[PDB]
Structure 1
Amino acid sequence: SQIVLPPHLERIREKLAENIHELWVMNKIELGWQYGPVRDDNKRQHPCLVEFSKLPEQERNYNLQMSLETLKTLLALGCHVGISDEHAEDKVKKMKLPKNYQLTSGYKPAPMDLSFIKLTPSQEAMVDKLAENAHNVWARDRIRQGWTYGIQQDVKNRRNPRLVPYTLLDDRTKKSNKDSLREAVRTLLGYGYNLEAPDQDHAARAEVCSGTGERFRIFRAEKTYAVKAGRWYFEFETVTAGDMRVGWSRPGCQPDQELGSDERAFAFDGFKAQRWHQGNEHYGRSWQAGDVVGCMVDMNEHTMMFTLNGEILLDDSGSELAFKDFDVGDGFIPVCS
């Protein structure tokens, strides 16, 4: 809906059209293919370098439309591309090019010195987005055609092996498309229209995409195992690192309420290095993958302690007591969230 044609590119649409034609033909010929008599899969030859009689006009239209879609996508990314200097045509100079690599079609190749251009990581990021978006557009076009994913190419059932999200795509094809499009972007930079593009700052994402009924699961010992006197110990190994709490809970602790948000639980949270009982206070350290937290309770003196990998965790003060005052009540049981 937001797409508009950029205000200085009206008269240059033609030149960009034949320019994209030039990139298309040079990319096709220097991807390893060459002009041949007949089309075969094993031949790896491109016979379509012939007069426009048979050459697919639909392929020409596809080339033009993907070029315009590419430029529209860069403008949609926020790239208010700027015209720098006409001197690109003057600066570009023909290097040594072999006779075989010289195109027999009659047009003069223009391979420029693309090594010295330093690709800033921002344009690398826009290149990643261009690859993702082009792959998505191709997948959408195939789905509109009726293609569906399969293990291998089946023309009869219209099963395509490559119809997967680009993040999970195979290395070879994504590398090929990625190099084709970096060549396209680098040729645009060679003509010199600089990418006044924005930077995508890091955005916080809650990451909570589980079932809406549960943001956490609480595991506890049975009520009948509640201990009301003595010195008790247990362990909690964290296979991963993240939102996890471990500690002691009252028999009446609710399962749908987060540990330590009320009076019914005393917990330690190593994701944010805090202790939880009726609130939040900083305590201890932050665990990692494979860390073992040892929880100790002493009901004789009404105290609680936590150790990370053997070392005793301590709060802002020098005390090792995570919780030092609580009524015994109906006892405590091991619990985690």
Structure 2
Amino acid sequence: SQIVLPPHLERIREKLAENIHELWVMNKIELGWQYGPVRDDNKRQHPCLVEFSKLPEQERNYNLQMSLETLKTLLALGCHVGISDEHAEDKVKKMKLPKNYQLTSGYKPAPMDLSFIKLTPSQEAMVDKLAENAHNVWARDRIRQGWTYGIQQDVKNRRNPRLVPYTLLDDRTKKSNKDSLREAVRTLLGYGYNLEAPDQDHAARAEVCSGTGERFRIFRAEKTYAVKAGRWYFEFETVTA
């Protein structure tokens, strides 16, 4: 709420959301799966492969808000974005694909030259962090709608297994949204806007999370076993260093 969206990032973000949707639809296309009319997942049909003109208002809006929240949170991390080259919009090239790859909607997605990108490990860790943030946003929406966590998915009790912290999140959905956000940030880069991240911070948390009373536990022999003469020896195995 504190930060505000610059206009240029907006006039790029509408097409950012559009080509995120293009990513998703072509993921489906090369997976080979097709659209289905009826809102039934189990009936071997999928109501998501919808033309952008007939695309649900709520779904397009939900994508638009994830895009704005993603770019805004990226800015709020301390990352600052710069337009070094205006010529990206001129050099930007469509990949030629066979007509069979085009979906029934009639619009042809154009995935650009993402491969030329140079990627830094801080930037992948950052992309993972925003994937975590998107998962947190989704979990917050589910919780306020009333969904709770469960080991087994049940719509009647509104219990879902994916409502878990990102560290414990299943790798399937983790990579599933990781690739989408990776492509989003990748295209934001490819359009001539490079991002510059704040430097990584090193710190020692010391895993201090014990009770207030105890920070350490002291074990000892009984006082009656005190030795006052001689040579004595014992051993201490360290299971954890």
TM range (shorter): 0.7 to 0.9
Distance 1:20 1:73 in 2: 18
Specify whether residues 129 and 52 from structure 1 end up closer, same or farther in structure 2 by C-alpha distance, changes over 3 A only. Answer: closer
User: What's the CA shift string for 1:283-321, capped at 9, x where partnerless?
Assistant: xxxxxxxxxxxxxxxxxxxxxxxxxxxxxxxxxxxxxxx
Secondary structure of 2:208's aligned partner: coil
Would the aligned equivalents of 1:20 and 1:67 in 2 still touch at CA under 8 Å?
Answer: no
Displacement of 1:219 in angstroms is: 0.6
Deviates more, 1:106-115 or 1:65-74: 106-115
Would the aligned equivalents of 1:89 and 1:191 in 2 still touch at CA under 8 Å?
Answer: yes
Displacement of 1:21 in angstroms is: 5.0
Would the aligned equivalents of 1:34 and 1:45 in 2 still touch at CA under 8 Å?
Answer: yes
Specify whether residues 181 and 68 from structure 1 end up closer, same or farther in structure 2 by C-alpha distance, changes over 3 A only. Answer: same
CA RMSD of aligned residues (A): 2.7
Displacement of 1:149 in angstroms is: 0.6
Displacement of 1:168 in angstroms is: 0.6
Would the aligned equivalents of 1:153 and 1:160 in 2 still touch at CA under 8 Å?
Answer: yes
Specify whether residues 28 and 190 from structure 1 end up closer, same or farther in structure 2 by C-alpha distance, changes over 3 A only. Answer: farther
Displacement of 1:154 in angstroms is: 0.4
Specify whether residues 117 and 106 from structure 1 end up closer, same or farther in structure 2 by C-alpha distance, changes over 3 A only. Answer: same
Would the aligned equivalents of 1:83 and 1:194 in 2 still touch at CA under 8 Å?
Answer: yes
Specify whether residues 89 and 30 from structure 1 end up closer, same or farther in structure 2 by C-alpha distance, changes over 3 A only. Answer: farther
Specify whether residues 86 and 27 from structure 1 end up closer, same or farther in structure 2 by C-alpha distance, changes over 3 A only. Answer: farther
Specify whether residues 44 and 225 from structure 1 end up closer, same or farther in structure 2 by C-alpha distance, changes over 3 A only. Answer: same
Q: TM-score, normalised by structure 1?
A: 0.64
Residue correspondences, number: 240
- The equivalent residue for 1:70 is 70
Specify whether residues 54 and 189 from structure 1 end up closer, same or farther in structure 2 by C-alpha distance, changes over 3 A only. Answer: closer
Secondary structure of 2:43's aligned partner: coil
Would the aligned equivalents of 2:17 and 2:64 in 1 still touch at CA under 8 Å?
Answer: yes
Distance 2:10 2:133 in 1: 24
Based on CA coordinates, which of the two structures has the bigger radius of gyration?
1
Distance 1:14 1:95 in 2: 21
Displacement of 1:54 in angstroms is: 6.2
Distance 1:155 1:145 in 2: 13
User: What's the CA shift string for 1:127-179, capped at 9, x where partnerless?
Assistant: 11011111111111100001011111101001101111110111111111111
Identity %: 100
Deviates more, 1:22-31 or 1:112-121: 22-31
Matches for 1:1-337 after TM superposition, within 5 Å: 1-6=1-6, 8-9=8-9, 12=12, 14-16=14-16, 18-19=18-19, 22-23=22-23, 25-26=25-26, 29=29, 33-42=33-42, 45-50=45-50, 55-239=55-239
Distance 2:10 2:38 in 1: 40
Displacement of 1:223 in angstroms is: 0.6
Would the aligned equivalents of 2:135 and 2:166 in 1 still touch at CA under 8 Å?
Answer: yes
Deviates more, 1:83-92 or 1:122-131: 83-92
Displacement of 1:205 in angstroms is: 1.5
Specify whether residues 43 and 97 from structure 1 end up closer, same or farther in structure 2 by C-alpha distance, changes over 3 A only. Answer: farther
Q: TM-score, normalised by structure 2?
A: 0.87
Displacement of 1:110 in angstroms is: 0.7
